[PDB]
Design a protein around this ligand. Structure first.
Ligand SMILES: [Cl-]
Ligand SMILES: [Cl-]
Ligand SMILES: [Cl-]
Ligand SMILES: [Cl-]
Ligand SMILES: [Mg+2]
Ligand SMILES: [Mg+2]
Ligand SMILES: [Mg+2]
Ligand SMILES: [Mg+2]
Lengths: 141, 144, 142, 144
């Protein structure tokens, strides 16, 4: 009962992130939604809705391919999916090389840097916010 | 996860299922309409009503079903304030929406999304009449 | 009247903050502009454009009254203008009492919590940002 | 001068050049480049948005902007969204798409011009120009 591939990516994310919470206390599914609302194209919105499904849920790149998602979309999701064998800097460098992933990752950083949603702030947060700021600047050069 | 945060996730899953496969005038999935309206809201109470504001027309989603799912009476009343009654005229419908503090705000963001012509392929004369009606209602909901 | 007073408020702010900068080096004039962009009414936008003119520049309250800004607008600006002998805690409590000042202050805290423009984030910012979060929550309480 | 950054100078130039001008909604025109600039993502886009309509002002010219310190690629971007005297609108939109910064600014320009939430009413005379905005908006979206 799906009309468009953007609707499918939503239903996949809502199901996959069901039961997860972000560090602010809210349902995690609203993070890819808030990133998707910052996007400008349907391709960016699809990747934004799924950008944390491979890392955090049972969704795999293989599953997305078998569900009909195009090669450039899945590769764009993989460009914003960190591998353990790489540093965070090498991950952001790999994100910038992808036209769709670069834009989605920028909006992902913006959402993660939105401290207006948080209850407090600790020293562990500012070290994480700092590398977000460095990655945010790198992706805008 | 708090009760309001749980209801907000619950409200999303109820909207996704109810609007599954539905399309709007442009042809895109209708679910993104409540989501775009929600993104304009400021509080979680408003976000919940925004996500469910067009689900009463669905057969599975009723007022008692939402009460059964844990949504409090004030939230459900807000959803009913932005749900047009059977024989109710548009002018009478906007008047009823302003009486509800949450529904009034949600209806404003609903009008903003409906006035967004960046998603339309072409504008006709019928669209002008419809957009003029949204402008009048938008202005009415912003007064004191 | 309101469309012209909004423009006048912009021109008063531009002239008053001219050449001032924030901690990131960006032009400070855009802080009231970005706060005014988050507002929903013309009264809020006017107060937001002028909310740091008394404290940071040579604009006075009598000056704004002389230019035609109504009493409620000037009072709202004063509700978000910290006094000398007033602590930050009492300042936030006083800004919540004014309907327009409360809303503009909320958007002011949102702009001050925007770290997308800072070059880096240190530990001294923890105190400032947590203070802003606490003040943000107090203003949102109903 | 008494200006900090090129962005601030661009603001002051737009403020002066549009001073007293009014838009279709009856508001001060200066807030149009500001609202276009609020949609932009980089400082280069914001500078061009703030100045995207200053060339009509007799004081503001390409030479003036170069004199003030604005880089040539910024000035060329402003000229990419400045329509020529005998140029057709379609040819103007095609020319603005070739410029990376200008394309983005022209999209945000079109979004603001299509924002009918600021309008007090709509007539059928607005149909043609709104359909031109929609057509040009889609044409700039075909890039990706
Ligand atoms: Cl990571
Ligand atoms: Cl939402
Ligand atoms: Cl830039
Ligand atoms: Cl033109
Ligand atoms: Mg993410
Ligand atoms: Mg609706
Ligand atoms: Mg301030
Ligand atoms: Mg323009």
């Amino acid at each position: 009962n799906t009309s468009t591939l953007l609707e499918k990516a939503l239903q996949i994310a809502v199901k996959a992130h069901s039961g997860q919470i972000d560090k602010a206390g809210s349902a995690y599914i609203f993070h890819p939604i808030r990133v998707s609302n910052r996007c400008s194209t349907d391709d960016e919105r699809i990747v934004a809705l799924l950008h944390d499904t491979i890392e955090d849920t049972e969704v795999t790149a293989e599953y997305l391919l078998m569900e009909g998602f195009p090669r450039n979309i899945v590769d764009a999701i993989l460009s914003v999916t960190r591998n353990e064998d790489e540093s965070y800097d090498d991950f952001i460098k790999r994100s910038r090389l992808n036209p769709i992933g670069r834009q989605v990752k920028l909006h992902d950083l913006e959402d993660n840097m939105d401290i207006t949603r948080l209850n407090e702030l600790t020293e562990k947060d500012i070290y994480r916010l700092n590398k977000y700021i460095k990655a945010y600047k790198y992706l805008k050069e």
